[PDB]
Amino acid sequence: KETAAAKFERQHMDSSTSAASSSNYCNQMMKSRNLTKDRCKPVNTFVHESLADVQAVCSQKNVACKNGQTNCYQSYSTMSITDCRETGSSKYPNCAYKTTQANKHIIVACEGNPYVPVHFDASV
Ligand SMILES: [Pt+2]
Ligand SMILES: [Pt+2]
Numbered sequence: 001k002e003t004a005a006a007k008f009e010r011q012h013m014d015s016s017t018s019a020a021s022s023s024n025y026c027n028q029m030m031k032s033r034n035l036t037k038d039r040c041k042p043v044n045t046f047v048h049e050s051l052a053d054v055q056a057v058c059s060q061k062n063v064a065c066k067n068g069q070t071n072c073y074q075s076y077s078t079m080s081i082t083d084c085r086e087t088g089s090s091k092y093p094n095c096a097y098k099t100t101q102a103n104k105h106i107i108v109a110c111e112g113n114p115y116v117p118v119h120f121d122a123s124v
Contacts, residue, residue: 003112004111004112004118004119005112005116005117007118008108008117008118008119008120009051010033011033011035011044011120012045012046012117012120013046013047013051014029014046014047014048014082015048015050016048018048019048019080019101020046020048020082020099020101022099023099024099025082025084025099026082026084026085026097026098026099027095027096027097027099029046029082029084030044030095030097031095036092036093036095039092040086040090040091040092040095040096041086042086043083043084043085043086044084045081045082045083045084045120045123046082046084047079047080047081047120048081048082049080053079054079054106054108054117055114055116057073057074057075057108057110057117058073058108058110058117059073060073060074060075060076061073061074061075061076063107065107065109065119065121066121069109071109071110072107072108072109072110072121073107073108073109074105074124075105075107075108076105077105078103078104078105079103079104079105079106080101080103081101081103081104081106081123082100082101082102083099083100084097084098085097085098085100102123104123104124105123106120106122106124107121107123107124108120
């Protein structure tokens with residue numbers, strides 16, 4: 001069974017390259033991370049920093065999470081991210097995404113030991 005920390009890395013970490021070039025990054029990435037298997041996951045963000053940099057967010061700016069828990073943290077620095085958002089015409093099993101590159105702060109929920117990200121809350 002996938003741990004919460006492992007799911008976070010599968011959904012949100014893309015440390016291999018510093019950006020999204022291809023307009024088909026999201027279609028490709030959403031597929032290879034298993035986020036088009038059963039349904040089209042509508043919105044998902046990928047972070048293009050090192051896992052060490054992202055795990056360090058858990059010792060940065062403590063903030064509330066969207067759900068009201070207080071184990072969220074905002075990255076002090078901006079980070080390279082890609083936003084994947086399903087198109088208006090996307091219908092499973094042919095999932096379609098627009099790919100948008102951005103440099104923004106991330107907000108993640110952290111938990112467990114080691115104390116690492118388990119949810120992507122938002123980018124700011
Ligand atoms: Pt800022
Ligand atoms: Pt959770």
